[PDB]
């Protein structure tokens, strides 16, 4: 009665592009070209696929299958599998809030850059502005110029002193106050995601049509543009030059594993929610396969889109694209690439489509990012929730805005690094390992192959059973152990993070998954009788 069965998706292509749109984001565009260039060049293509075939694809497919089979949220699905691990469904929620605290602000920057890209003369071309210093030296000026340790470029000046305004803060210690411009930008973004989420999967399935197809068009325009630029072969050479001695280093394998894990994004509850709304007899294998393989291919061509332009930039300057692509962060897009676009014909066009591309790269992923949590909460508190969806979605968008006010400060970029590298990563990897173990070693892999055999009509191959049993948990275990054994020393804009930053990162990191052990203790302490009977009634799913 009343609700009973849940709703279903409006078309196969909508869900196929929704998952693709969530999988593809900023990092696919710029993190993969950098990590591919600095870790063996073209030879990075070899371990990147292995970590996919053995690690990424099995988690992606197993998550999309569990989601499309059980049709439950990230929280209520554990009550029907392993109640003690229900805290997982909560942990991810908290995790999402941290991601949403910064991932949108980044887009805000692009948005503030987009609304600043409608002028006939781009603001970051000249030095006669209200934010430039006396060190600002630009081009279209007297030739012979020689760069100095204190000299700066109008683009670097525009990012540093105008939009980001990071010169007004001394670090994590002093970062206040808040920039109202980026607050309004992130409000507009939280509004464009509000009207794209508030109705449920209908609008995020109609809006995804645009958010997921535009980046390929923009990447195509930038691609055929950058291929025509003189001296673009240098960036391609630096992008594909095989350096097989890097493969001897045990670091590049960990870099590839981590990169393909985030980029694929299993273990976050997004694929669970997206798979939940679908036909029971609908095929899941082909969907997961195609989407992931596209997500990789798209990264691969994005590499060219970036390195052709950076090759042209190295030609205009003096070569060694590694020198011009030293900084691995937002500065590679907001300063370097932007300065390269400004010196091209129809600069307004390629700027509008570039920043618009960035925003459209971000939107689909935060759409999903919220979609998983919303689905989880609505499925965990039914009839206490779902009274309206707009109320909860609004409470989340607003919560993310107040959670992003720390990032909208002048030293907000500092917090972005802190949140992006020390907090979300190791916790998502941790909960992904816990989930992979619970589904593989608690619920039983044989019964899982039986559920896929019921849904798809055939039992999964031995390659996948042997992947879920041993290969995938060791795949996540390797990354977690590698990170925990040596957290990277953070540095951003000639500013090294204090030594206690990692403690703050761990505090944010630890505060996310306090619920899984405290919930195991909660259910283990609430259910009467012996601990063996409590863990037996707590590990085995509900019989009816």
């Amino acid at each position, epitope marked *: 009665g009343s609700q009973g069965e849940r709703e279903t998706w409006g078309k196969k292509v909508d869900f196929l592009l929704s998952v693709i749109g969530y999988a593809v984001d900023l990092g696919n565009v710029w993190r993969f070209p950098y990590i591919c260039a600095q870790n063996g060049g073209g030879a990075f293509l070899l371990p990147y696929t292995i970590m996919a075939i053995f690690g990424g694809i099995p988690l992606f497919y197993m998550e999309l299958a569990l989601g499309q089979y059980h049709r439950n949220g990230c929280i209520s699905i554990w009550r029907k599998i392993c109640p003690i691990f229900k805290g997982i469904g909560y942990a991810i929620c908290i995790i999402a809030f941290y991601i949403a605290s910064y991932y949108n602000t980044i887009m805000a920057w692009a948005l503030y850059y987009l609304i600043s890209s409608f002028t006939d003369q781009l603001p970051w071309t000249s030095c006669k502005n209200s934010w430039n210093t006396g060190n600002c030296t630009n081009y279209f000026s007297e030739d012979n110029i020689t*760069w100095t*340790l204190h000299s700066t470029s109008p683009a670097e000046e525009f990012y540093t002193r105008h939009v980001l305004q990071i010169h007004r803060s001394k670090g994590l210690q002093d970062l206040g106050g808040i920039s109202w411009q980026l607050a309004l930008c992130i409000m507009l973004i939280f509004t464009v995601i509000y009207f794209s989420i508030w109705k449920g999967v209908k609008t995020s399935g109609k809006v995804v049509w645009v958010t997921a197809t535009f980046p390929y068009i923009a990447l195509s325009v930038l691609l055929v543009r950058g291929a025509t630029l003189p001296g673009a072969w240098r960036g391609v050479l630096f992008y594909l030059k095989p350096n097989w001695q890097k493969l001897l280093e045990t670091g590049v394998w960990i870099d590839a594993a981590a990169q393909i894990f985030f980029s694929l994004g299993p273990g976050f509850g997004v694929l669970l929610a997206f798979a939940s709304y679908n036909k029971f007899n609908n095929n899941c294998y082909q969907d997961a396969l195609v989407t992931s393989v596209v997500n990789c291919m798209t990264s691969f061509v994005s590499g060219f889109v970036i390195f052709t332009v950076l090759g042209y930039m190295a*030609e205009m300057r*003096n*070569e*060694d694209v590694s*020198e011009v692509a030293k900084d691995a962060g937002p500065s590679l897009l907001f300063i370097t690439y932007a300065e390269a676009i400004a010196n091209m014909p129809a600069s307004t066009f390629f700027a509008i489509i570039f920043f618009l591309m960035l925003i459209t790269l971000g939107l689909d992923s935060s759409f999903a990012g919220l979609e998983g949590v919303i689905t989880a909460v609505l499925d965990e508190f039914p009839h206490v929730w779902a009274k309206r969806r707009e109320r909860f979605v609004l409470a989340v968008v607003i919560t993310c805005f107040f959670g992003s006010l720390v990032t909208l400060t002048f030293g907000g970029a500092y917090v972005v690094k802190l949140l992006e590298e020390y907090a979300t990563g190791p916790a998502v990897l941790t909960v992904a390992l816990i989930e992979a173990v619970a589904v593989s070693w608690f619920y039983g892999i044989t019964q899982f192959c039986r559920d896929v055999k019921e849904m798809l009509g055939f039992s999964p191959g031995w390659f996948w059973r042997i992947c879920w049993v041993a290969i995938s948990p060791l795949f996540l275990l390797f990354i977690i152990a590698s990170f925990l054994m040596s957290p990277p020393q953070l540095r951003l804009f000639q500013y090294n993070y204090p030594y206690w930053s990692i403690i703050l990162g761990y505090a944010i990191g630890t505060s996310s998954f306090i619920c899984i052990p405290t919930y195991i203790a909660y259910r283990l302490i609430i259910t009467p009788g012996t601990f063996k009977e409590r863990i037996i009634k707590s590990i085995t799913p509900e019989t009816p």
Partner: antibody
Amino acid sequence: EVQLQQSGPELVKPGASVKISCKASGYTFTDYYMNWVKQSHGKSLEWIGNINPNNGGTSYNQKFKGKATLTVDKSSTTAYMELRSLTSEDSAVYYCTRSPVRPYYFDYWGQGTTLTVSS
Amino acid sequence: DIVMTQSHKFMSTSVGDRVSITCKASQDVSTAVAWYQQKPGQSPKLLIYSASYRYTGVPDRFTGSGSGTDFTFTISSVQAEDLAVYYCQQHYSIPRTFGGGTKLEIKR
């Protein structure tokens, strides 16, 4: 004008260490990278590494990693290079030369320091 | 790394003749080549930067040409005080390497 005055010649026994100074004048010391070029007897020039005077931002060569240590002092605008584990190959003339960030040329050099590693 | 190869270790010329020294690099360099002059007993002195551009305080008789991997340093009127060892050096990729050196001996 721009003058880079190094230390005098040094005769040191093998296995010891030696530090060479580099007093800069005639320009804004915090504006340019400070470099060290090794020139062997009858050989070519060999870039050892640079250092950023603002924070001591060193950048050594893979061939000199663990061989040379570059330091800098802003209070007196003077750079230093220390060499440990001295052998017969280190007996050469060392220069300290100023250089901008881009284009990375060596505009002004020091007079040189004749190093002799022998017992 | 980069290997700056100066094939001619020694070159003979006369006072007033046109002399040109060649510099061969490993990979493509575009226009990132500097020419230094080291007189016997003195420190190297920068003459050319970025293939062709002359530095401040350098006579007009010293020129530079080339665009790619092979570069040429040209002296139009050789003087008696031009007797020195000439070095070429790339300034694009880390690390910065030098050439073997061409001791220009004067024939009379």
